[PDB]
Amino acid sequence: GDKKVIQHLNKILGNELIAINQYFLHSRMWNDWGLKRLGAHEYHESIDEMKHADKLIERILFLEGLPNLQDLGKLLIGENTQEMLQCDLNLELKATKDLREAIVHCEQVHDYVSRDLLKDILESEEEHIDYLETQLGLIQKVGLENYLQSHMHE
């Protein structure tokens, strides 16, 4: 296994480990505030990131690298719904950037299986961005109090 691929993989893994904690905490927060629809959705984003992290891990061990679950980067914890979303969105725009750089590297050293995995993960983070923007947009279109009312119940 090419040595920089494993580094790019562990960099993505770093990004997924942050997201898991950022999204989990954010979910629980929304739950404790009684905004249980945002709590459910955010809870699902978090489980998603865990499964990306799992795939990455298996891939690294396969290529004979060392998965680093030790270094946890910086959690972006908002203190209200709108910040909370904007943070996740910032965290995604970042992982989106790193994912692209990795896929480039993989393509360059003919590691097409790793490229494929990254490509799948990227499709999913992009779906997440779509959800996030839409969410922010809807707040402008219906107003914050309404938007929040609509995520009280499931």
Taking the complex as a whole, how short is the minimal distance between the CB of residue 146 and K ion, in angstroms? 5
Least CB distance from residue 147 to ligand HEM, whole Å?
26
128 is in an annotated binding site: yes
- Least separation in angstroms between CB 142 and K ion: 8
Binding residue per annotation — 49?
Answer: yes
Q: Which of residues 114-153 bind Fe ion (CB under 5 A)?
A: 152
Question: Which of the residues 33 through 92 are near ligand HEM (CB under 6 A)?
Answer: 47, 50-51, 53-54, 69
Q: Is 149 annotated as a binding residue?
A: yes
- Judged by CB, which is closer to a copy of itself: 7, or 63? 63
Q: How far apart are CA 128 and CA 134, in angstroms?
A: 10
- Tell me whether residue 153 is annotated as binding: no
Residue selected from 2, 7, 24, 119 as contacting ligand HEM according to rule CB under 6 A: 24
Q: What share of the chain is helix, strand, coil (3-state, %, to 5)?
A: 80, 0, 20
Using CA atoms, how far apart are residues 12 and 34, in angstroms rounded to an integer?
33
Q: Rounded to whole angstroms, how far apart are CA atoms 47 and 3? A: 29
Task: In whole angstroms, give the CA distance from residue 37 to residue 111.
Answer: 40
Query: Which residue in this structure is represented by tokens 């480039």?
Result: 104
Which stretches of the chain bind Fe ion, using CB under 5 A?
152
